[PDB]
Design a protein around this nucleic acid. Structure first.
Ligand SMILES: Nc1ncnc2c1ncn2[C@@H]1O[C@H](COP(=O)(O)OP(=O)(O)OP(=O)(O)O)[C@@H](O)[C@H]1O
Ligand SMILES: Nc1ncnc2c1ncn2[C@@H]1O[C@H](COP(=O)(O)OP(=O)(O)OP(=O)(O)O)[C@@H](O)[C@H]1O
Ligand SMILES: [Mg+2]
Ligand SMILES: [Mg+2]
Ligand SMILES: [Mg+2]
Ligand SMILES: [Mg+2]
Ligand SMILES: [Mg+2]
Ligand SMILES: [Mg+2]
Ligand SMILES: [Mg+2]
Ligand SMILES: [Mg+2]
Ligand SMILES: [Mg+2]
Ligand SMILES: [Mg+2]
Ligand SMILES: [Mg+2]
Ligand SMILES: [Mg+2]
Ligand SMILES: [Mg+2]
Ligand SMILES: [Mg+2]
Ligand SMILES: [Mg+2]
Ligand SMILES: [Mg+2]
Ligand SMILES: [Mg+2]
Ligand SMILES: [Mg+2]
Ligand SMILES: [Mg+2]
Ligand SMILES: [Mg+2]
Ligand SMILES: [Mg+2]
Ligand SMILES: [Mg+2]
Ligand SMILES: [Mg+2]
Ligand SMILES: [Mg+2]
Ligand SMILES: [Mg+2]
Ligand SMILES: [Mg+2]
Ligand SMILES: [Mg+2]
Ligand SMILES: [Mg+2]
Ligand SMILES: [Mg+2]
Ligand SMILES: [Mg+2]
Ligand SMILES: [Mg+2]
Ligand SMILES: [Mg+2]
Ligand SMILES: [Mg+2]
Ligand SMILES: [Mg+2]
Ligand SMILES: [Mg+2]
Ligand SMILES: [Mg+2]
Ligand SMILES: [Mg+2]
Ligand SMILES: [Mg+2]
Ligand SMILES: [Mg+2]
Ligand SMILES: [Mg+2]
Ligand SMILES: [Mg+2]
Ligand SMILES: [Mg+2]
Ligand SMILES: [Mg+2]
Lengths: 93, 46, 77, 102, 63, 18
RNA sequence: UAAGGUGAUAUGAACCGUUAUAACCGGCGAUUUCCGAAUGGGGAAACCCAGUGUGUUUCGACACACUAUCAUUAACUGAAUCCAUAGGUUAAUGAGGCGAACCGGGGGAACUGAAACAUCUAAGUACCCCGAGGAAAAGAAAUCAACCGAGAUUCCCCCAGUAGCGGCGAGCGAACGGGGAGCAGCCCAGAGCCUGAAUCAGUGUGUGUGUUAGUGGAAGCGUCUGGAAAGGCGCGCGAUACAGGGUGACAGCCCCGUACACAAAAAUGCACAUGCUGUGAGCUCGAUGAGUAGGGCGGGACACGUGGUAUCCUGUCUGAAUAUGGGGGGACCAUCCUCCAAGGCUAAAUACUCCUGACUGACCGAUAGUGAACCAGUACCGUGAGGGAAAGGCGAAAAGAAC
RNA sequence: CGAAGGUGUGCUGUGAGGCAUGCUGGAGGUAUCAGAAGUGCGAAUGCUGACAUAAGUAACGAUAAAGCGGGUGAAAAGCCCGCUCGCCGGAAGACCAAGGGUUCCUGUCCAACGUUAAUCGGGGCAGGGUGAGUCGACCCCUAAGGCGAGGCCGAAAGGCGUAGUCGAUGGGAAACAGGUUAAUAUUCCUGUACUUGGUGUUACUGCGAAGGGGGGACGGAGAAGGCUAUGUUGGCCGGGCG
RNA sequence: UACGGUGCUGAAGCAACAAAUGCCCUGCUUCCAGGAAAAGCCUCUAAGCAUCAGGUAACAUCAAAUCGUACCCCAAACCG
């Protein structure tokens, strides 16, 4: 949580779903895609330092990949971890 | 009517799981045979 | 197991032969007995699992001589 | 180590374009080359709205086997074979006839 | 040339270079996901450079 | 598109003793 | 080694190179999540939970390192119990698993044949277990011969389906001797006089020859048919290269290759030479493997099934001589020959092929050939061990059919 | 300037066969005489694949039951909306565990799948969706039982077992109501709480075990009494004068 | 206002009676077939500290990780 090297690989991408848009408008919560092995703590430190924003709490969930077919071949989407990071009141990104 | 297979993951892993098979040499010989045959799924563990 | 610690005698297998010469597999085991031999140099009793043939060789060879061979064999008396 | 390079001038040895001269454009790893405006084929290109909306009968160059073309001497006016030679420690190509370095 | 210059310097300069190099990679990853990055070849470039600098660091660390 | 076949068979009838 | 290239179905986008850091290929390294001998503890494999110590500080924590068991060795401590010993704690080492067949050893069937079936056969086979090497095992006569001699072991062809063994049934089946492949002999059981002699093992040091990338590599045009010429018909040329493959139909001369001739910064094999570190050569005088050989009993192995049955191994009970002495010569005795057990080591000829390269086939050509020419030990089936498929072909080029 | 194979025709030999030709097909084929065979198929309830037959026949999975208007659509008995009717209601409702593993929600499409059609679907395709100091798992603790240093035993493999270490189906700290999404909520927002550790400050100070005791800690049946969930009625409030 | 919805406002919000297989009740009574364990927790002291450490109490403060969480679940989603 304290190493700048660990933090720079924790955040993978922002989530741009309809739920994420509602989160921007209603509860000032940012939805991110993080490393599958990441813990709520380190994620709070990385966002606080790399975005200069105050974080209230971070809840995480694991999304199970979907099973799809490419032609006649079976395949599976990868599992990923979704983090709901709630920013302190007032601050905006 | 109650059919023969009543699934249970804990029972399934404790009976035929990788660690149950490898506990004894005879089970380890099962793994050797399945490795020689080239099985994609060595044991029943997920 | 049933192995003599001096001579190394171990169970062997053979045939029960009847009057009709029927052969059935059997085992011959050594006449093993646990005995406490008095070793004078250490003023101690050391217990060994020996056969009756092993007991005879201990008298002939001396208690100290056999133990020296045992240490070379690494039998951990 | 390749006898035919990107900018070489060649003459077609076999096919419907026998005797025609052209300039190589692309050398494909499959042992085929694309020559500028030689082996024209009319491809029925389906229209794509995202880009190149108007699809019509399009004339483009098709790949030709390297064995089916030969380098053009441009001095004797005939097809020639390529050899290799070390001149100043660098391997260069020369025409088999009249053995002059390219 | 890049590898040569890396070795020439010292550990401290290299560490500053690694952190700076990684920072554009993190920035590039964000632009890539947001659809704002049109020059996609830098993503592979910085990844190789990160590997190159770390390789020189191990070489210059005695072992 | 992945059809198959299976047969186990069973045995029963009446008597033929007269 | 290079003018192209970002592995495939598989395009596309955004690019990176073009005379040499693009790519690709070889050598040597760097990194190598988690499970798996799994080794910090546990565990429903790819997960859960730590301890110690070093170092970091934003005082929330964080990062490395170590911590399995067993064997051997050495220290330190440490009972009953005075010394001791057991035990205990550390530290260095080795091991642990995996893998096709071949090999040695420890165990070890039955079906079947006998036209049934017990001895016997199948067979010391299948199978289980331990162990090891590139080979293993065996091996330097207590061996054979026959009054002449040979001179370790192993393997091949004979001897020979002979001599024998055998409910003398089924069946099993030598040896002596000969011709070959290959040959190699030594050490301890002890001390001197000489002396480090030969020889062997470590290692460097060169030379030679390979291996791991590679390089160059001769000579054909015209015309005819044809969608296309490599085919037909003419006239040439190369060949230490007319092995093959590809190219729009069948190519010595279009292309890749072939014969050829070459190539190594670095790593490595092999062999010779050579330098160090061990290692002991020679001579004289000694010594000469004891609960052993043999025997009784019960089995096993010898082709040999207890038979008149030698020889070998021993579970059991006994038990010598020891060079002025013992073993063997197929019961046994005498004579005579021959050898010296109860301690060890040893290359080659031999067996096998998971794997690598090249090449070959009166071998197969998709219901064949591996189960699998195709994303096959897959789909599927079964709790599981395990079972286990089907499925190749547009055309030269996708030019894969705009409208 | 048309190979093999395929399909006709003609001729020919005592036969197995042979020769040649028209057509398809598109590239092989191969005399003679010798040689070697996985050398000739109608049968084996043969094997594999394909295709018939019965046959447009049986059947289309509980006799709880359907009907209509409107809409969308190329097309509506089956889909959507609406109004009726009927069935279950100690279930045919609601929430879970086990087990399954995206079947959940939205858009789009009708090849295959649905025993019919299908615009629909638990079908295809593309996106989205599960948020926990107080819920579980995990963690601490043990039952049966498993494994098991050393140890005992056993041809080998191994068997048994001590200290230990695992193993819930049992024992251990703590969260409720309201609101909100197309799909999540004791997990998310609002309001109001609670628990166990770490650190610091202050004050007062006997602490301390792998020990000891208590507690945890426990059956069957039966009998009431006091309560709550919950229901009924009245009152109250709003609406109604059929 | 997009049939949704969204925003605002919002009365009474009591009593009696009946009533569990749910709670007091891990109780009480009775019986014979005589009805887990351990840890957390409370307490007691050994050795080893008793200035310390540690304990108690009050504030302030940090921390509570990781994993499941959709949906079906007497069924068209499980075993047939
Ligand atoms: N005590 C022994 N032990 C073993 N072998 C021996 C013994 N004596 C002699 N031999 C051998 O027997 C042979 C000589 O036989 P013999 O005993 O009659 O003569 P010797 O004089 O005793 O022997 P040597 O000359 O060696 O001393 C030699 O090969 C010798 O090696
Ligand atoms: N039984 C075989 N199995 C496989 N390949 C074989 C066999 N026999 C021969 N070959 C092939 O034959 C090749 C050798 O044949 P061969 O030596 O007789 O040719 P050559 O022309 O006579 O040469 P030269 O005259 O120099 O001896 C082998 O390299 C091998 O590829
Ligand atoms: Mg969670
Ligand atoms: Mg070349
Ligand atoms: Mg581990
Ligand atoms: Mg373990
Ligand atoms: Mg557990
Ligand atoms: Mg260790
Ligand atoms: Mg093994
Ligand atoms: Mg018989
Ligand atoms: Mg080896
Ligand atoms: Mg003898
Ligand atoms: Mg004799
Ligand atoms: Mg002797
Ligand atoms: Mg075919
Ligand atoms: Mg096949
Ligand atoms: Mg046949
Ligand atoms: Mg037929
Ligand atoms: Mg017939
Ligand atoms: Mg029939
Ligand atoms: Mg038939
Ligand atoms: Mg078929
Ligand atoms: Mg009909
Ligand atoms: Mg009918
Ligand atoms: Mg009818
Ligand atoms: Mg009918
Ligand atoms: Mg029905
Ligand atoms: Mg209608
Ligand atoms: Mg229709
Ligand atoms: Mg009803
Ligand atoms: Mg009711
Ligand atoms: Mg009822
Ligand atoms: Mg579940
Ligand atoms: Mg699906
Ligand atoms: Mg749905
Ligand atoms: Mg249908
Ligand atoms: Mg669907
Ligand atoms: Mg043990
Ligand atoms: Mg439970
Ligand atoms: Mg919250
Ligand atoms: Mg009430
Ligand atoms: Mg009841
Ligand atoms: Mg739910
Ligand atoms: Mg729901
Ligand atoms: Mg049903």
């Amino acid at each position: 949580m304290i190493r700048e090297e660990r933090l720079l690989k924790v955040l993978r991408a922002p989530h741009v779903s309809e739920k994420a848009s509602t989160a921007m408008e209603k509860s000032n919560t940012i939805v991110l895609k993080v490393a599958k092995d990441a813990t709520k703590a380190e994620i709070k430190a990385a966002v606080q330092k790399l975005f200069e924003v105050e974080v209230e709490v971070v809840n995480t969930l694991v999304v199970k990949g979907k099973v799809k077919r490419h032609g006649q071949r079976i395949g599976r989407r990868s599992d990923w971890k979704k983090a709901y990071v709630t920013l302190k009141e007032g601050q905006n990104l | 009517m109650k059919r023969t297979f009543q699934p249970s993951v804990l029972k399934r892993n404790r009976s035929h799981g990788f660690r149950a098979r490898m506990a004894t040499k005879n089970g380890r010989q099962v793994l050797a045979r399945r490795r020689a045959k080239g099985r994609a799924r060595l044991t029943v563990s997920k | 197991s049933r192995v003599c610690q001096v001579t190394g005698k171990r169970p062997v297998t053979g045939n029960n032969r009847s009057h009709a010469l029927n052969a059935t597999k059997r085992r011959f085991l050594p006449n093993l007995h646990s005995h406490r031999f008095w070793v004078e140099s250490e003023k101690r009793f050391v217990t060994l699992r020996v056969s009756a043939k092993g007991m005879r060789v201990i008298d002939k060879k001396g208690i100290d001589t056999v133990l020296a061979e045992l240490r070379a064999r690494g039998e951990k008396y | 180590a390749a006898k035919i390079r990107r900018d070489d001038e060649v003459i077609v040895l076999t096919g419907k374009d026998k005797g025609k001269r052209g300039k190589v454009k692309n050398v494909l790893s499959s042992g085929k080359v694309i020559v500028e405006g030689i082996n024209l084929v009319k491809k029925h290109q389906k229209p794509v709205p995202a880009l190149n909306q108007p699809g019509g009968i399009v004339e483009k160059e098709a790949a030709i086997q390297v064995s089916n073309v030969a380098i053009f001497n441009a001095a004797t006016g005939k097809a020639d074979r390529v050899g290799f030679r070390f001149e100043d420690g660098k391997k260069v190509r020369f025409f088999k006839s009249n053995s002059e370095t390219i | 040339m890049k590898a040569k210059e890396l070795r020439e310097k010292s550990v401290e300069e290299l560490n500053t270079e690694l952190l700076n190099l990684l920072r554009e990679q993190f920035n590039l990853r964000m632009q890539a996901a947001s659809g704002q990055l049109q020059q996609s070849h830098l993503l592979k470039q910085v990844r190789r450079d990160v590997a190159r600098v770390k390789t020189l660091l191990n070489e210059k660390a005695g072992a | 598109x992945x059809x198959x076949x299976x047969x186990x068979x069973x045995x029963x009838x009446t008597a033929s003793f007269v």
